[PDB]
Amino acid sequence: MKQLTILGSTGSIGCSTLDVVRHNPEHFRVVALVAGKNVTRMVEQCLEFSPRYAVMDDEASAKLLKTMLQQQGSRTEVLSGQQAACDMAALEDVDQVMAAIVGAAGLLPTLAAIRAGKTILLANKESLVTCGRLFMDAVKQSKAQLLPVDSEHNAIFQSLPQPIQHNLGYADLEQNGVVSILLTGSGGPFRETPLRDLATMTPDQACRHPNWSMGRKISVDSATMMNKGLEYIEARWLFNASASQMEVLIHPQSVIHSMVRYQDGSVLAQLGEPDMRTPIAHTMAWPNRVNSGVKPLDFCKLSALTFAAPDYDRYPCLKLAMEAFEQGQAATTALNAANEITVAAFLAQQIRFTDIAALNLSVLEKMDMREPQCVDDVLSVDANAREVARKEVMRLA
Amino acid sequence: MKQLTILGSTGSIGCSTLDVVRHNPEHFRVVALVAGKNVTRMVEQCLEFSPRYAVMDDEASAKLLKTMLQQQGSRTEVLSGQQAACDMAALEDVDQVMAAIVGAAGLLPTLAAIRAGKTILLANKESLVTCGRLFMDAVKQSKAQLLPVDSEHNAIFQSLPQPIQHNLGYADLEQNGVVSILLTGSGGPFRETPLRDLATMTPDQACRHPNWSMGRKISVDSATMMNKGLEYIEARWLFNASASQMEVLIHPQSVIHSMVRYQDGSVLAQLGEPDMRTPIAHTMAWPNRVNSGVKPLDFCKLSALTFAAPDYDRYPCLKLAMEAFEQGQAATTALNAANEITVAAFLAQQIRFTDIAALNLSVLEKMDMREPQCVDDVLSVDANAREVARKEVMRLA
Ligand SMILES: O=CN(O)CCCP(=O)(O)O
Ligand SMILES: O=CN(O)CCCP(=O)(O)O
Ligand SMILES: [Mn+2]
Ligand SMILES: [Mn+2]
């Protein structure tokens, strides 16, 4: 009977984790729900699971949730602010923490759940893209169990050997028989578009396109593969890998979520439906399993499976993210940062598609950075990179 | 520093296991070599690895091997017959036993390795296709460690959870989160041949055809899928699965060696080159890994991957085998028996290709069998099945 705390219990991955707790009530219990402003879905969930706690980002919002919970009689106690969240993450009697609150918002609560040595359902990129050095040391220190929920990492983890699974981060790949890790990705919708044509690409040609893909910003990240590359950054930290023990493969159909290469030639892989309840269920049930309400992969009703290597000319955002890792957590925190600006510039139509790569590039250049050292060094490197970025979209007016 | 005994040190899988020991001398050592008649390759091997024992099938052979070893000064001691082999399999100081001696020749030494409770690199179909009830009960009794080397079971084993790997045969699938096991297979060379055309198939059309396939008799078992079907029989026994927890899938390219379905939708799979040194190295190094000298799978230089369900009208030898499992070890020992006859009749041109399916069927019918009870009951059911078969090829003269 595991007990959890969800950080971002109102977003996509939050509800999926709640749909997972719902169909498996015999093993899971909510002790705390943490959200941002959706007081609306939060009451519903507090009403359904009845966490001992509910936390919202501001008092304005809590004083209202506190109110609708009042209406229903929900004994659920309401708190507010960031501290409240970190306190739910470090909660004494809590077993796992679905670190699904994204952005910089989540760096501290994910960290507080880490510091407390808890099984961590790591459901946010930024935690390792910006605070990777810190976060992994915080794990060594307290022996917190990282369990990645991201489709790719979930698959790479499931495909790894056991003694590397219990020591996530300090488990040496190569000594335990791993030749390399196979990070796979669709390759974006402009994978076969002639190179001189990526410049004339519109936002409508890249935005939530089929077979495991549906999100405004990440479509441009799937399209530029700034997404894969950023998962290269987390992979490297998460699994303790060196650029030689890494591989990025274009797998258009996204059936194979990602693989792991071994010494004797065996390649271990994971596949299933794109549904996030699969990796949310795996991580929660581990080292056992539970149902999630997801479809058994019909290998018949399926597309043919192909692969390819990325063309670093067609996907510059990936070579950037690879070199960015080689420069330090300041270069990747600022690369993640400037990228959100630029992608955004592209979606509003301020710069060409091919300008996201070139500009994220520039900010990374025009900025002599120095490795961070806490959840604040990282915040700052982000606000300086955003600024070199917001200011860069500008010269193109 | 593991020490082994190889049963059938001269055949294909033997040499591959000898090539695995060669490139990893730091972890493996031969204590005994067991062959059949090839005194010729046996000397060379005895000369190279210097096992404390070499065993041949007859004194005639051994008095000659004993002689050429004399020539070179090989201290290796030479023995003969079956007892010798069983003794090499039960050897006190031996850790693993590559049970690669195939046929009925190997049921007892494989058994002797089992009884003595040793890590068993299982490399012969018959062991479970005929003596499945007995072999698994002998495993329970002495807690021997089966480690399948067959491309498919190796893939299905690698893909299972840990607590099912260490208790091979008794670890319940479903209770450990396994939904079913995906037994995959090319589909044979007549997978797309119109149905009324299988009857006019010749032996040159089905014999050692590319992409993980090279053998006179199994090519016909690939073509009829009597091979897949027979692997459905070992699987059921090996992994402790019910016909519901089993799935047979056609995968033409044979990249994916086989998979394992889980409750949360996750499908774990193994892929790699068709080389046998991969599963031979995995089983030998287990729970660790060693190199084997095989090629890192180039996902680039690869065909598109497709899947399909077998058409039980196209592959009758598969339904036969599935229904055969449901009748007892007498129906499967006799099905494996009659199949070697018929296939063989087909290879010699005594019956049509489509006749293998119908005759194996018949023998199974025309023969009210009764479940075996030792390595003798199985031999017998084999001899009476061959006869109902040799005699059946006959009515078509
Ligand atoms: O968790 C899901 N993804 O990472 C999918 C994003 C699309 P991509 O694999 O082409 O980057
Ligand atoms: O170990 C190897 N095999 O099983 C391959 C035999 C050919 P098939 O997969 O089509 O039965
Ligand atoms: Mn992902
Ligand atoms: Mn096989």
UniProtKB/Swiss-Prot annotation, chains A, B:
It is an enzyme of class 1 (oxidoreductase). The keyword NADP applies. Coiled coil: none annotated. Keywords: Cobalt, Isoprene biosynthesis, Magnesium, Manganese, Metal-binding, NADP, Oxidoreductase. Inhibited by fosmidomycin. It catalyses: 2-C-methyl-D-erythritol 4-phosphate + NADP(+) = 1-deoxy-D-xylulose 5-phosphate + NADPH + H(+). One of its GO terms (biological process) is isopentenyl diphosphate biosynthetic process, methylerythritol 4-phosphate pathway. Changing residue 231 to K: No effect on KM for substrate. Reduces activity by over 99.9%. Changing residue 209 to Q: Increase in KM for substrate. Reduces activity 5000-fold. Homodimer. This is 1-deoxy-D-xylulose 5-phosphate reductoisomerase.
